[PDB]
Structure formats: structure tokens, C-alpha cells
Amino acid sequence: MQIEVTVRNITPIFSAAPGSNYITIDGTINPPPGVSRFPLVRTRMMYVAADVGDGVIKSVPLQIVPGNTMRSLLRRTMLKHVIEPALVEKGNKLSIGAYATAYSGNATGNPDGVPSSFDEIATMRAHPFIGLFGGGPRMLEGRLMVDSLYPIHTNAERILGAGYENEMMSGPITQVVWARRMDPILNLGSSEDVEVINGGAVAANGWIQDLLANSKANGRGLKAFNAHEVVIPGLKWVWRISLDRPTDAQVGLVLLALNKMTNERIAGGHSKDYGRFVIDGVSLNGEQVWSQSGITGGEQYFDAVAEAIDGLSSKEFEQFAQSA
Amino acid sequence: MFVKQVFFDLGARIHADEARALVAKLLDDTQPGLVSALMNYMPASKTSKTEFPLVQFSNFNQGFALLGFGEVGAQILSDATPIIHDAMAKLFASRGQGVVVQVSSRDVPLSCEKRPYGLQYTVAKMVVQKKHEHRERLANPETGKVFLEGLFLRSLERQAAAVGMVLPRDLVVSFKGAERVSSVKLRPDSTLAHGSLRHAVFEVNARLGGLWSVGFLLSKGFGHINTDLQLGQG
RNA sequence: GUGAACGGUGGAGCAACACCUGAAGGAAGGCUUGAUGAGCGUGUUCCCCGCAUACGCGGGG
């Protein structure tokens, strides 16, 4: 079962690529030393083979949001607005391990050596939340295959073989966004502002001297300057959600998580409002089901997840999490 | 090399010379040696050094600035800044509700290279006349022009040699004109005054890329402006 | 004349077949680049330091 979630990003997308990268005042990502490099955390990039010129395929950059990131995102919306309301309406109580395994695939960092008995595999695989995301102490396989967010871009013409041939962006899709820290005690100005600090003006003054003693001279003070590379907004992305012999309840759960997908953020940089997005279209095995009012279609999936929400107990999450 | 500027804001404007007098009077009872370092006194006596002043007080729109030239002067500002800040903090917390004193710091490198085209550099409040001979040169424009030429040049070479970097010795300067003529008093309510030029314009073939102080009474805060700020700017 | 002198260890032969490192996993959470040294007061012979060696030059606050 194949799902293709085509979205447009309202705010810019920052999913931080690990790597202490550096930036100058105008471009030159990771310059040579002595040009006064500034710290730079770039957005997550996937190298991708692409048709660069006629007959030549090169490994080129393309900035993505990771499939692991949005696997955990889909699992998170699934659990916060469907699963947790079900377990509050029936009063079912999860354990610490059951909660942590339902959100993270494991209760501890040690998976168990034994494999689960086949009845437990069949019952858990049949269960929609467990089937979509496996794991646990006995390392269950899940039915969900969450692919990364590629933009609809020339670097992904080799990726989008079927469909999405139009709406192709030629140029780069990143902008460097600069954030500075400022010290408020440097910027306060007035003593009527410092009448709310206990200790008066002399305490604020003494902190100014601490920072002056740091300015002459490794406890970090304040007032840093940073840049972070972001993916530019308004561009169409594609999400691929593949399923592995799914029950109708698992697909209905995915569509239940998918309808509210917009409230959440496909990114990091929470405070900067990075990750806001609107779903342009959703296709089940290629068929378009998406409307402005969520998903229009797939009624057997919605009915199956309706009957699977009912009778969903905590004990499924408890038994799977419990280590041998 | 580099010159350090440290800016102190009392919430009110204080002139550079009376700030120098206030800094002298505030820490006089205790911490005398730091004052000797700040004011370029002799190590043994109270009188000042005849050489270039590594540490010179400067204007600030909300108070006073300190300029330290070279590694030694920057170190003098580095060891002098918090004690000086603490002194104005206790002085301005003793009377009134109290004010909060805010600072800034900046390490500007100095540089120069010769260019085959003249460049317009203005200066404000630069002293020029100190003796009766200097008055006699100032009466006639022909003999006053070359005196101002030599004064501007020898100030550039002096603060070069003091900062520890080499200046090309083929520079040709020129002086176009000054907007006003005014006197400078060393101490208030003294009959002695010294002549000074206001908004003088000089033209040098080379470029200057730092803080460059010209003429007499440099530690009092006269005749320095930042040559980086004027550069390509009107 | 070494109880010597003479004399091929040779031929043939498959280390093969079978076997999925791959399952679970959020790069995050916080942060004003504007804020700046920049344009605004002093109306005449008084201090101290060197080169000299006083005929004067240089300079300090």
C-alpha cells in the first residue's frame, strides 16, 4: 500500500543537519580559517544522483526533511490526537515502558535477545499502532515505511519517475537566516527599568563588569551571533508512506493522523515557527483523496480505524513493551 | 597593530577633558598606579610622558570613551575598565536614585597603503598653535601652510612609530582649509588659551584605515577621528 | 678405482554446495545584528622633557 502526501510549506523548513559548519558575512559556507567564521547549522541535506547535463548523472545536493524525523512525527500526531484520546475515553493506563515504547519503539536501550512468539507477532502486527511502528524489547517489524521529504526539484527528477513532472524548481532552495543574541542588561538603559531587579542598579552594573572582564579575556556569557541555513518556504514537497500488507485499520490510522497533519511542524526550530505546511494532495495507491476538509475518500479505512479505536486497550501496549 | 575603544555611558554627556579630570579625582585616594597607567604619568613623578600617549580619552554622545593604542595600551584599558566602571557606579549611586552605566568595546586594526590619487580627510577640534613662533607662522598663509603640512605628516609618522608599524615615507599631504578658528583652555578659568582649527580638511594620497590622531594635546581628546568611518562616506 | 659405478617417486584428482546485518530510532530546544564610535563649550604666554649646549629647535597636559 503506497501513499504520496504532496505538501506546500508555509513557513521555512529547518531540520538541522549535524556538523559544525561555518559561514562568513556573505556566503562562503565553511571558509578557510582566519576570515572570522560564524557557527552555522545547515538544514538536512540528502545527496542524490541527478541528470545534470545530457548523459551525465552526478551526486548533487538536495535539502530534505528526514524520513526518520517524519516517521516519528506521524507516530507522534497518531498518538497524541487519536491513541491518547482513546486511552483517556476508556480510562486505559499505560506504563512508563508502554508509553516510551509507543512513542520511541523501545522501553530501554537494551533490546531483548529472544524473538517474540508468533501469536504475539500476529496480534501486534494486526494491531494498527504496533503494526505501523514495531520495535520493543523483542524488536518487532513494523508495516510502515516512511520515506524522506523531497521537494519537487530538478535534483529529484530521478526520484519522481511517476507523476510530479511539472511544478519543478530549477534554482537553489535554501536561504541563510541569521539570528543574533542580545544581552538585555546591556540594552536596558534606565534605572526605572532596574527598579524591578532586586539589588538595584549596582547588581546589573556588576554583571556588566563580569561581561567586560570576559570581553578583555571559558564560561560563555551572552550576545552570540549565529546563522542557520533554511529551506525556503512555499515550495512543494512529496512524502512517501509505504505499507507492508496492511490491515485496513492501520491505513485508517495513517489517514486519521494525516488529516490533522497541518497542526504540526515538519521541522526543527520550534520557536521560529519553522515547519508550518499545508497538504496539497494525498493519493492512496495513486488515487487522489485530499480536500480542504481533510481526506475525502477511503471510507473503509476510516470505518476500520473506527472499529479498531473501540476495544483498543492498554494491554497491547503493555505486553509488547514488557521485556522477557 | 590594533587600537581598542571602550565606551562609557553615564546617562548624560560629559566632555573628554572634564572626564579626564573626573577620572583623576575619583581614584586619586586609592589605586594611584592604575591612574599613572591611564594618564601616561612618569613611573616616579606626577608629570606626564613626553612621548606619544598610548591611552587617550575621547568624546562619547552619552559620556566618555577611552582609546588604547598598541598591545600595551589595550592591556591598560583591559586592566583599567572594571575598577573605573565601579567608581562611576558608586559615584552615581551615591546621589539621586542612581543610574546604570553601559559600555561597549571594539578592537579596530590600523592600516595604510599608498595610492596614486589624493583623498579627502577632515578633522574637527585639532589644536595647532603652542608657541609664539607658531603664532608667527599662522599670520601668513604661505608659511602657515607648510607648517600644517609638516605637523600633519609628523603626527602620522609619530603615531606609526608608536604603534609599531611601518609607514611609507613617500606620502604627500595637502591642506585645503578650515571652517572655524577657536581657542582651547587647558584648565577652566585660566587666562592662557591655545589656538585651534575647526573642521580642517587635509588631502593625502595614501589611505588610512584605523584611528589616526593628529596634532597636539591628543590625550585631552583633540584631533582624532576614525578614518574608517569617513572612508567612502559623505 | 670413495663396500664403488646405474637408476625420475611418478602418474590421476574442483573445497564444494546451501545462507538477506537487519530489524527499532525526531537534530533538537532556546535565542531583537543595530546598535555603534560621527554633526554641538573654551579668545593668549603659564608649567615639565629631550637635542643641544643656549643662537634655538623639537612636545607634554
XYZ file of C-alpha atoms (C1' of nucleotides) in Angstrom:
619
model
C 0.000 0.000 0.000
C 1.524 3.257 -1.255
C 0.668 6.783 -0.076
C 2.068 10.014 -1.535
C 1.495 13.139 0.574
C 2.201 16.251 -1.504
C 2.508 19.343 0.699
C 3.460 23.004 0.475
C 5.463 24.568 3.247
C 4.053 27.754 4.714
C 6.935 28.656 6.953
C 10.555 27.826 6.060
C 11.955 24.411 6.918
C 14.878 23.894 9.228
C 15.763 20.299 10.071
C 19.281 20.688 11.436
C 21.988 18.729 9.667
C 24.612 17.601 12.197
C 28.055 19.022 11.554
C 29.652 22.158 12.993
C 29.543 24.147 9.815
C 30.669 27.726 9.396
C 29.657 30.811 7.464
C 31.022 34.231 6.579
C 29.119 37.519 6.416
C 28.332 36.986 2.712
C 28.116 33.295 1.771
C 31.204 31.034 1.626
C 29.939 28.094 3.652
C 32.808 26.583 5.656
C 35.513 29.077 4.650
C 39.261 28.659 5.329
C 40.219 29.803 8.915
C 41.080 33.456 9.816
C 38.142 35.075 7.899
C 36.150 35.173 11.191
C 33.871 32.177 10.726
C 30.458 32.211 12.361
C 28.763 28.989 13.509
C 26.292 27.553 11.024
C 23.904 24.634 11.426
C 22.656 23.775 7.976
C 19.359 22.154 7.123
C 19.328 18.414 6.499
C 20.679 17.600 3.071
C 20.427 14.390 1.062
C 22.918 13.805 -1.709
C 21.021 12.491 -4.726
C 22.027 11.299 -8.174
C 20.574 13.625 -10.781
C 20.607 14.270 -14.532
C 22.935 17.253 -14.503
C 23.814 17.532 -18.177
C 22.934 15.350 -21.146
C 24.103 11.818 -20.424
C 25.775 12.601 -17.111
C 24.442 11.767 -13.653
C 26.091 13.366 -10.654
C 25.650 13.200 -6.917
C 24.188 16.667 -6.250
C 22.760 18.268 -3.091
C 19.072 18.395 -2.243
C 17.759 19.580 1.109
C 15.247 17.255 2.751
C 13.454 16.505 5.973
C 14.482 13.005 7.164
C 12.186 10.022 6.861
C 13.113 9.026 10.396
C 12.135 12.526 11.556
C 8.735 12.381 9.966
C 8.241 8.749 10.861
C 8.439 9.927 14.455
C 6.254 12.909 13.519
C 3.473 10.745 12.026
C 3.748 8.450 15.055
C 3.532 11.480 17.339
C 0.366 13.006 15.826
C -1.116 9.484 15.657
C -0.503 9.010 19.334
C -1.370 12.481 20.640
C -4.700 13.052 18.889
C -6.009 9.530 18.236
C -4.397 6.999 20.563
C -4.135 9.018 23.799
C -7.765 10.278 23.425
C -8.852 6.641 23.016
C -6.997 5.598 26.163
C -8.497 8.523 28.074
C -12.047 7.781 26.895
C -11.816 4.178 28.015
C -9.639 5.069 31.011
C -6.798 2.767 29.963
C -3.491 3.452 31.724
C -0.143 2.899 30.002
C 3.048 2.126 31.882
C 6.244 4.150 31.659
C 7.656 1.458 29.396
C 4.424 1.191 27.392
C 4.368 4.963 26.889
C 8.056 5.120 25.963
C 7.805 2.158 23.584
C 4.697 3.563 21.916
C 6.483 6.861 21.288
C 10.035 5.615 20.680
C 9.882 1.942 19.730
C 11.739 0.836 22.878
C 11.328 0.992 26.640
C 15.056 0.699 27.389
C 18.220 0.923 25.336
C 18.696 -2.843 25.563
C 16.612 -4.918 23.141
C 15.958 -8.442 24.309
C 17.750 -11.365 22.744
C 14.724 -13.631 22.355
C 12.289 -13.177 19.458
C 8.602 -12.762 20.157
C 6.319 -15.773 19.820
C 4.292 -15.850 16.621
C 0.939 -15.252 18.332
C 2.382 -12.036 19.789
C 3.705 -11.053 16.348
C 0.333 -11.800 14.726
C -1.667 -9.930 17.434
C 0.759 -6.935 17.482
C 1.066 -6.918 13.640
C -2.778 -6.965 13.406
C -2.900 -4.043 15.908
C -2.666 -0.721 13.951
C -0.310 1.341 16.193
C 2.014 -1.670 16.873
C 1.944 -2.787 13.191
C 2.760 0.721 11.856
C 5.712 1.127 14.241
C 7.305 -2.025 15.600
C 10.296 -2.276 17.890
C 10.124 -3.026 21.591
C 12.374 -5.374 23.518
C 11.903 -8.231 21.032
C 12.413 -5.883 18.044
C 9.146 -6.130 16.139
C 8.993 -5.369 12.445
C 6.512 -2.648 11.518
C 4.353 -2.372 8.433
C 5.182 1.299 7.816
C 7.942 2.566 5.517
C 8.325 6.335 5.961
C 10.336 7.991 3.199
C 12.066 11.379 3.462
C 10.647 14.710 2.269
C 11.997 15.513 -1.082
C 10.995 18.799 -2.670
C 9.649 18.671 -6.197
C 13.019 19.723 -7.619
C 15.355 19.009 -10.559
C 17.735 17.213 -8.217
C 14.854 14.782 -7.667
C 13.794 14.163 -11.281
C 15.355 10.704 -10.926
C 13.354 10.217 -7.718
C 9.978 11.307 -9.122
C 9.782 8.917 -12.049
C 5.982 8.627 -11.936
C 3.994 11.821 -11.503
C 5.186 15.273 -10.360
C 6.784 16.078 -13.715
C 5.502 19.660 -13.622
C 5.956 22.084 -10.679
C 9.789 21.687 -10.963
C 12.108 24.285 -9.278
C 15.432 24.970 -11.045
C 17.415 27.166 -8.664
C 18.640 26.537 -5.122
C 16.080 26.219 -2.353
C 17.999 27.462 0.707
C 18.397 30.828 2.380
C 20.736 31.639 5.239
C 18.772 33.104 8.152
C 20.790 34.985 10.761
C 19.831 35.146 14.434
C 21.764 37.193 16.964
C 21.595 37.003 20.695
C 21.485 40.283 22.584
C 22.232 40.957 26.205
C 19.288 42.736 27.867
C 21.356 44.208 30.708
C 23.484 45.960 28.082
C 20.290 47.198 26.416
C 18.190 48.226 29.442
C 19.249 51.877 29.540
C 17.302 53.230 32.516
C 17.155 52.760 36.289
C 13.354 52.837 36.277
C 13.777 49.607 34.337
C 16.111 48.286 37.041
C 13.779 49.012 39.950
C 12.247 45.569 39.248
C 15.613 43.795 39.562
C 16.364 43.047 43.183
C 19.662 44.540 44.240
C 19.093 47.726 42.262
C 21.292 49.201 39.577
C 24.536 48.047 41.218
C 23.765 44.363 40.556
C 23.111 44.998 36.852
C 26.270 47.148 36.792
C 28.324 44.352 38.350
C 27.061 41.914 35.744
C 28.203 44.440 33.088
C 31.662 44.188 34.667
C 31.608 40.417 34.542
C 30.946 40.657 30.807
C 33.609 43.351 30.465
C 36.125 41.032 32.157
C 35.080 38.401 29.615
C 35.477 40.963 26.808
C 39.097 41.528 27.835
C 39.927 37.827 28.190
C 35.623 29.703 29.445
C 32.131 30.376 30.762
C 30.094 31.656 27.825
C 28.345 34.925 28.546
C 25.674 36.182 26.184
C 25.258 38.060 22.883
C 26.169 35.460 20.286
C 25.775 35.680 16.511
C 24.585 32.641 14.572
C 23.334 31.655 11.157
C 21.284 28.693 10.123
C 20.600 27.531 6.589
C 16.887 27.069 5.990
C 14.798 25.664 3.162
C 12.823 28.481 1.526
C 9.031 28.441 2.027
C 6.202 27.991 -0.415
C 7.782 25.049 -2.231
C 6.054 21.747 -2.872
C 7.362 18.611 -1.135
C 6.457 14.954 -1.590
C 6.153 12.383 1.217
C 6.074 8.643 0.569
C 4.320 6.334 3.047
C 4.563 2.721 2.003
C 2.760 -0.094 3.752
C 3.565 -3.784 4.062
C 0.411 -5.919 3.736
C -1.552 -3.544 5.985
C -4.769 -4.142 7.789
C -7.494 -1.651 6.920
C -7.227 -0.321 10.488
C -3.561 0.630 10.002
C -4.280 2.551 6.785
C -7.232 4.186 8.522
C -4.954 5.135 11.392
C -2.490 6.699 8.911
C -5.327 8.659 7.307
C -6.537 9.661 10.790
C -3.063 11.014 11.635
C -2.747 12.558 8.095
C -5.997 14.644 8.184
C -4.703 16.797 11.114
C -1.097 16.674 9.755
C -1.262 20.521 9.322
C -1.411 21.482 13.032
C 2.097 20.084 13.490
C 5.513 21.156 12.212
C 7.692 19.258 9.700
C 10.905 20.674 11.110
C 13.002 21.859 13.947
C 13.351 25.409 15.112
C 10.091 25.391 17.037
C 10.078 28.996 18.257
C 10.841 30.453 14.796
C 7.553 28.836 13.569
C 9.591 26.632 11.163
C 7.620 23.683 9.806
C 4.149 25.043 9.077
C 2.712 23.425 5.976
C -0.477 22.721 4.029
C -1.147 19.409 2.286
C -1.779 19.964 -1.416
C -2.811 16.384 -2.150
C -2.886 12.824 -0.777
C -3.083 9.785 -3.109
C -3.795 6.208 -1.918
C -2.095 3.907 -4.490
C -2.136 6.931 -6.816
C -5.768 7.941 -6.186
C -6.464 11.488 -5.013
C -8.434 11.699 -1.760
C -7.382 15.040 -0.305
C -9.717 18.001 0.074
C -9.565 21.206 2.083
C -11.639 19.499 4.799
C -9.178 16.675 5.260
C -9.441 13.385 3.392
C -12.426 12.764 1.116
C -12.460 9.030 0.434
C -11.108 5.819 1.867
C -14.252 5.198 3.895
C -13.459 1.535 4.594
C -10.159 2.583 6.172
C -11.936 5.176 8.325
C -14.597 2.644 9.336
C -11.925 0.067 10.186
C -9.979 2.512 12.326
C -13.308 3.496 13.894
C -13.949 -0.099 14.945
C -10.287 -0.533 15.905
C -10.260 2.540 18.160
C -13.148 0.924 20.007
C -11.906 -2.026 22.018
C -8.312 -0.749 21.907
C -6.921 -1.498 25.362
C -3.708 -0.565 27.138
C -2.726 -4.243 27.431
C -1.488 -4.352 23.837
C 0.981 -1.589 24.630
C 1.823 -3.228 27.976
C 2.525 -6.758 26.640
C 4.634 -5.582 23.634
C 6.773 -3.267 25.843
C 7.340 -5.923 28.523
C 10.785 -7.443 28.162
C 11.496 -11.129 28.666
C 48.597 46.827 15.087
C 45.217 47.437 16.748
C 43.598 50.151 18.872
C 40.920 49.428 21.481
C 37.952 51.740 22.104
C 35.896 51.369 25.300
C 32.756 53.482 25.676
C 31.137 54.503 28.971
C 27.606 55.942 29.219
C 26.593 57.779 32.393
C 23.176 58.719 31.006
C 24.464 62.254 30.413
C 27.116 63.743 28.163
C 30.458 64.549 29.775
C 33.282 66.250 27.870
C 36.556 64.372 27.396
C 38.783 66.796 29.325
C 36.467 67.116 32.322
C 36.026 63.339 32.189
C 39.820 63.078 32.389
C 39.760 65.421 35.410
C 36.918 63.401 36.974
C 38.718 60.067 36.443
C 41.809 61.616 38.027
C 39.844 62.892 41.023
C 37.687 59.741 41.569
C 40.533 57.154 42.079
C 43.209 59.570 43.469
C 42.827 58.478 47.134
C 43.348 54.765 46.292
C 44.645 52.767 43.239
C 47.145 55.561 42.222
C 49.316 53.348 39.930
C 46.387 52.425 37.615
C 45.884 56.236 37.274
C 49.597 56.536 36.291
C 48.990 53.844 33.642
C 45.779 55.509 32.443
C 47.212 59.028 32.273
C 50.660 58.337 30.995
C 52.417 59.771 34.043
C 56.015 59.097 34.889
C 56.622 55.949 36.986
C 58.118 58.061 39.791
C 56.572 61.542 39.499
C 53.235 63.136 38.622
C 54.246 64.805 35.339
C 53.300 63.199 32.044
C 55.402 61.433 29.434
C 56.840 63.462 26.557
C 56.289 60.582 24.111
C 53.074 59.653 22.282
C 50.114 58.903 24.596
C 49.118 55.244 24.274
C 45.956 55.937 26.296
C 43.856 58.956 25.205
C 40.326 59.947 26.419
C 37.667 60.606 23.718
C 34.152 62.059 23.228
C 31.048 59.892 23.515
C 27.489 61.053 22.861
C 26.356 59.661 26.214
C 29.647 60.048 28.094
C 33.309 59.293 27.565
C 35.399 56.876 25.545
C 38.887 55.506 26.143
C 41.338 54.730 23.339
C 44.296 52.432 23.912
C 46.898 52.131 21.176
C 49.035 49.036 20.797
C 49.118 45.922 22.936
C 50.316 47.923 25.961
C 47.512 50.491 25.718
C 44.915 47.785 25.097
C 46.212 45.972 28.191
C 45.950 49.241 30.152
C 42.284 49.529 29.153
C 41.799 45.821 29.921
C 43.081 46.159 33.486
C 41.534 49.606 33.979
C 37.933 49.150 32.720
C 36.106 47.405 35.643
C 37.621 49.466 38.506
C 36.797 52.697 36.550
C 33.215 51.423 35.893
C 32.843 50.583 39.608
C 33.979 54.093 40.548
C 31.372 55.822 38.383
C 28.800 53.295 39.632
C 29.398 54.222 43.273
C 29.602 57.947 42.414
C 26.295 57.887 40.548
C 24.622 55.625 43.113
C 25.651 57.923 45.981
C 23.480 60.808 44.716
C 19.967 60.567 43.300
C 18.058 57.390 42.557
C 21.091 56.026 40.719
C 21.869 55.428 37.046
C 23.037 52.348 35.154
C 26.312 52.694 33.275
C 26.577 50.903 29.928
C 29.691 50.186 27.915
C 30.962 48.988 24.583
C 34.322 47.663 23.379
C 35.924 47.360 19.956
C 39.378 46.369 18.645
C 39.968 48.211 15.347
C 43.118 47.329 13.372
C 45.133 50.161 11.848
C 46.458 50.032 8.301
C 47.753 52.175 5.461
C 48.796 51.813 1.819
C 49.903 54.430 -0.716
C 47.503 55.209 -3.573
C 48.220 57.342 -6.696
C 45.260 59.664 -6.042
C 44.533 62.210 -3.344
C 41.976 61.505 -0.638
C 39.867 63.946 1.385
C 40.122 63.533 5.174
C 38.521 66.043 7.532
C 39.293 66.581 11.223
C 37.472 68.520 13.949
C 38.767 70.353 17.082
C 42.517 69.842 16.320
C 44.951 72.166 18.239
C 47.745 73.728 16.141
C 49.346 76.728 17.916
C 51.505 76.307 21.015
C 54.281 78.934 20.980
C 54.782 82.478 19.731
C 56.616 81.113 16.683
C 53.510 79.050 15.888
C 51.531 82.300 16.025
C 54.052 83.909 13.660
C 53.649 81.076 11.147
C 49.851 81.330 11.400
C 49.771 85.005 10.359
C 50.898 84.415 6.758
C 49.165 81.645 4.750
C 52.299 80.678 2.783
C 54.405 79.983 5.876
C 51.421 78.530 7.755
C 50.553 76.035 5.036
C 53.918 74.236 5.163
C 53.803 74.224 8.978
C 50.416 72.489 8.892
C 51.818 70.106 6.238
C 54.748 69.142 8.441
C 52.541 68.922 11.536
C 50.036 66.536 9.914
C 52.847 64.448 8.438
C 54.935 64.232 11.647
C 51.803 63.303 13.631
C 51.158 60.407 11.208
C 54.786 59.192 11.456
C 54.804 59.623 15.255
C 51.735 57.533 15.910
C 53.004 54.955 13.369
C 56.303 54.603 15.159
C 54.458 54.466 18.462
C 52.021 51.774 17.299
C 54.891 49.691 15.918
C 54.055 49.548 12.197
C 55.853 50.920 9.143
C 54.526 53.878 7.122
C 55.724 54.509 3.574
C 57.820 57.666 3.659
C 56.777 58.995 0.226
C 53.421 60.453 1.276
C 52.462 63.931 0.086
C 49.742 65.680 2.073
C 47.914 68.935 1.384
C 45.675 71.262 3.392
C 42.627 72.869 1.778
C 41.006 74.923 4.528
C 39.425 75.030 7.959
C 35.900 76.126 8.806
C 36.498 77.936 12.103
C 39.213 79.129 14.484
C 38.738 78.766 18.237
C 40.703 78.621 21.468
C 41.298 75.697 23.813
C 41.724 76.201 27.562
C 43.946 73.746 29.418
C 42.174 74.428 32.726
C 38.918 76.368 33.225
C 39.103 79.984 34.455
C 42.681 80.377 33.222
C 43.773 83.296 31.056
C 46.086 81.058 28.998
C 44.444 79.716 25.817
C 45.828 77.975 22.739
C 44.729 78.348 19.133
C 42.904 75.570 17.330
C 41.230 74.838 13.995
C 37.676 73.556 13.484
C 36.658 71.230 10.611
C 40.033 71.333 8.872
C 40.368 69.429 5.592
C 43.522 67.537 4.614
C 44.253 65.539 1.465
C 46.597 62.542 1.481
C 47.469 60.282 -1.461
C 47.559 57.224 0.804
C 44.541 55.695 2.535
C 44.197 55.370 6.296
C 42.198 52.517 7.799
C 42.146 52.981 11.566
C 42.115 55.577 14.326
C 44.694 58.265 13.489
C 45.325 61.197 15.843
C 46.912 64.385 14.579
C 48.372 67.480 16.312
C 48.812 68.478 19.894
C 47.010 67.559 23.143
C 45.997 64.097 21.957
C 45.344 62.699 25.448
C 42.849 65.517 26.112
C 40.699 64.298 23.219
C 41.523 66.649 20.345
C 42.265 65.977 16.694
C 41.366 62.320 16.325
C 38.558 60.996 14.135
C 38.077 57.472 12.814
C 39.419 57.249 9.287
C 37.434 54.067 8.626
C 34.155 55.942 9.104
C 34.930 58.740 6.651
C 36.193 56.236 4.051
C 33.888 56.313 1.032
C 31.346 58.224 3.121
C 29.833 61.695 2.846
C 89.105 -47.450 -8.654
C 85.013 -43.106 -2.488
C 81.977 -51.607 0.074
C 82.370 -48.233 -5.667
C 79.839 -47.366 -10.654
C 73.350 -47.339 -12.652
C 68.888 -45.611 -11.525
C 62.732 -39.592 -12.413
C 58.780 -41.184 -6.878
C 55.783 -40.972 -10.808
C 51.098 -40.613 -12.623
C 45.091 -39.419 -11.733
C 42.071 -35.791 -8.774
C 37.171 -28.799 -8.346
C 36.999 -27.330 -1.371
C 32.470 -27.843 -2.883
C 27.328 -26.957 -2.195
C 23.311 -24.010 0.732
C 22.826 -18.991 3.658
C 19.092 -11.367 3.230
C 23.321 -7.438 9.058
C 18.679 -6.028 9.598
C 15.343 -5.062 12.382
C 13.618 -0.364 16.316
C 15.347 5.319 16.443
C 12.745 13.402 15.747
C 18.700 17.086 15.341
C 16.869 19.248 18.736
C 15.343 23.173 22.462
C 16.197 28.189 23.429
C 17.741 32.981 21.255
C 15.744 41.540 18.884
C 22.562 42.454 14.210
C 21.957 47.810 15.213
C 23.355 49.016 17.596
C 27.922 51.983 17.025
C 32.352 55.430 17.963
C 30.407 60.624 13.874
C 27.498 66.896 13.468
C 27.222 70.535 19.258
C 31.729 74.863 25.292
C 36.626 77.483 25.812
C 39.704 84.430 22.902
C 46.793 84.181 24.939
C 52.238 83.111 27.489
C 51.878 79.828 32.121
C 54.114 74.516 33.567
C 57.846 69.999 32.773
C 61.066 66.654 28.945
C 64.990 65.907 25.393
C 68.565 67.614 21.325
C 71.679 70.956 22.085
C 74.827 73.410 24.854
C 71.657 78.129 24.902
C 71.610 81.326 18.708
C 67.124 77.937 19.426
C 64.772 73.801 17.790
C 61.612 69.826 18.739
C 56.451 68.272 22.843
C 53.629 67.111 27.336
C 48.708 68.316 29.757
